[PDB]
Amino acid sequence: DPMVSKGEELFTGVVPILVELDGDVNGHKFSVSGEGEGDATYGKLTLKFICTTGKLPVPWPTLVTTLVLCFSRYPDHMKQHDFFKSAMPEGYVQERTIFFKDDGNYKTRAEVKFEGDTLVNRIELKGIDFKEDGNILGHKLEYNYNSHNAYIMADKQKNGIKSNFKIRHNIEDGSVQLADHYQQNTPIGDGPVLLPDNHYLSTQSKLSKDPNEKRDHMVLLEFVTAAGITLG
């Protein structure tokens, strides 16, 4: 399928990634710049993010989902369901509302597209209704991340996809902070895409620090795989 091969050719080998985010949470303005590479053959990306405005006013783990699902590994029997690569190089808009239980919400809008040979994720984020001294603005979340699945559903009206899933953030008191994610993706172009049938993505992320890096930062290793139509 030339529509499938288009994405395969765009994501063959190691693709450079640039991530740029401008944020405002409760009036705290911040920016994040990320660089790295993705290897969609293995569902793999490596990225290092810098807070370029000083200290990040929210915990790094809360930004992992916001900071490129085109790098997901879709197995051979699933390639017809890979909306994300099919929208390339023109790209897609990824929009979310992330509801933090008993706290505020992030609203995010991002464009994911190629600029030359580089896959770019450009993001605006606005956070509201946060507690200035809660788990998020108070930095009470552990610097780690939990694996999860997410159900992807076609959004025919928008020629795109939608997904609603739960992220669990460990709190430093031993409890868990829920982050309920609403997501919708729409192609930037007006041409055909691969509109998928419902299926699951499975993802694991590892967060680490560069001991030589004095700036506030996050090193991310992230694997995403299309697990199947069903979980079985």
UniProtKB/Swiss-Prot annotation:
Q: What is the effect of changing S72A?
A: Increases fluorescence at warmer temperatures such as 37 degrees Celsius. In GFPmut 3; highly fluorescent mutant when excited at 488 nm
Outcome of mutating F49L: In mut3.3; shifts fluorescence lifetime from 3.03 to 1.88 ns. In R10-3; matures to the red-emitting state with excitation and emission maxima at 555 and 585 nm, respectively
Write out the tissue specificity statement of the associated record: Photocytes.
Q: What is the effect of changing D155V?
A: In EBFP2.0; shifts the excitation and emission spectra to shorter wavelengths and increases quantum yields compared to BFP
Reported biotechnological use: Green fluorescent protein has been engineered to produce a vast number of variously colored mutants, fusion proteins, and biosensors. Further generation of mutants led to more stable proteins (at 37 degrees Celsius for example) with brighter fluorescence and longer fluorescence lifetimes.
Q: Which domain of life is it from?
A: Eukaryota
Plastid as a keyword of this entry, yes or no, is no
Write out the GO biological process terms. bioluminescence; generation of precursor metabolites and energy
Q: What is the effect of changing N146I?
A: In ECFP; leads to cyan fluorescence, folds faster and more efficiently at 37 degrees Celsius and has superior solubility and brightness
Q: What is the effect of changing K79R?
A: In Topaz; shifts the major emission and exitation peak up to 20 nm
The entry's keywords? Chromophore, Luminescence, Photoprotein
Q: Family membership, please give it.
A: Belongs to the GFP family.
Its function, per the record, reads:
Energy-transfer acceptor. Its role is to transduce the blue chemiluminescence of the protein aequorin into green fluorescent light by energy transfer. Fluoresces in vivo upon receiving energy from the Ca(2+)-activated photoprotein aequorin.
- Name the record gives this protein: Green fluorescent protein
Species per Swiss-Prot/TrEMBL record: Aequorea victoria (Water jellyfish)
The top of its lineage is: Eukaryota, Metazoa, Cnidaria, Hydrozoa, Hydroidolina
Name of the gene encoding the protein in the UniProt record: GFP
